[PDB]
A paper describes a structure:
Genetically encoded calcium indicators based on truncated troponin C are attractive probes for calcium imaging due to their relatively small molecular size and twofold reduced calcium ion buffering. To overcome these limitations, we developed an enhanced version of YTnC, named YTnC2.
Compared with YTnC, YTnC2 had 5.7‐fold higher molecular brightness and 6.4‐fold increased dynamic range in vitro. YTnC2 was successfully used to reveal calcium transients in the cytosol and in the lumen of mitochondria of both mammalian cells and cultured neurons. Finally, we obtained and analyzed the crystal structure of the fluorescent domain of the YTnC2 mutant.
Numbering used by the authors: 5 to 68, 72 to 152, 208 to 306
The structure:
């Protein structure tokens, strides 16, 4: 009913493009898949098109679409991310890795005709060649210490620890913001903290629903395509809103 809902109504094709430079190690990632807001579901296959990804794939999960979360009927007024469509929104993060480097990220999420686009620039700085990021020491998971076709999607995510990020309004920016923590596991059994600060602004001039403070609840699953030669990641995210 409200701005930009009808654009999400079925199966929306996704395009993700990313270019990155972490300590001078240059890389590109492209990818495609599908968002289904009615399920709060996202599925992607993202490929490193330049060869070996120089950071661990788990560290880019958050960077590589809150518009595909499913907002319940009582909360459709708080859906900032759909309300900004089709023109879209700039998503900006700082990510601090404890006792290591950090990422700066800037992405534009928007409709390019039918296709929902996440076009990203990533830089990162002050990493240790030998540390957990440029060392590739993180495990490959995101386990943070229609009734039918849908239940197939939910099967892959049942059991995974949920992760809740609080979304707050920023009136000055006519946007939203969030602070959260991602605790990556390592193989050795300890944790790698990734301290996320996020800012989202509309690309359009005209106004938006600035939401009451609510949470987005995620479960993410990382897998592989068994027929894919390249360095790659399959990511599925189940995202719903609550708490207001």
């Amino acid at each position: 009913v409200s701005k930009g809902e009808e654009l999400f109504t079925g199966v929306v094709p996704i395009l993700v493009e990313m270019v990155g430079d972490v300590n001078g190690h240059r890389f590109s990632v492209s990818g495609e898949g599908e968002g289904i807001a009615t399920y709060g579901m996202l599925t992607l296959k993202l490929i490193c098109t330049t060869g070996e990804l120089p950071v661990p794939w788990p560290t880019l999960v958050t960077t590589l679409m809150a518009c595909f979360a499913r907002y319940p009927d009582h909360m459709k007024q708080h859906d900032f991310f759909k309300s900004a469509m089709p023109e879209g929104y700039v998503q900006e993060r700082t990510i601090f890795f404890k006792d290591d480097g950090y990422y700066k990220t800037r992405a534009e999420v928007k409709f390019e005709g039918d296709t929902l686009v996440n076009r990203i620039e990533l830089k990162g700085f002050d990493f240790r060649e030998d540390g957990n990021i440029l060392g590739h020491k993180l495990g490959y998971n995101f386990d943070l210490s229609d009734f039918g076709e849908f239940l197939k999607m939910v099967e892959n995510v049942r059991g995974i620890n949920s992760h809740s990020v609080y979304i707050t309004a920023d009136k000055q920016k006519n946007g939203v913001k969030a602070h959260f923590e991602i605790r990556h596991n390592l193989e050795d059994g300890s944790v790698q903290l990734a301290d996320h600060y996020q800012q989202n602004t509309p690309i359009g001039d005209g106004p938006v629903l600035l939401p009451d403070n609510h949470y987005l609840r995620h479960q993410s699953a990382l897998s592989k395509d068994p027929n894919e030669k390249r360095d790659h990641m399959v990511l599925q995210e189940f995202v719903t809103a609550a708490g207001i």
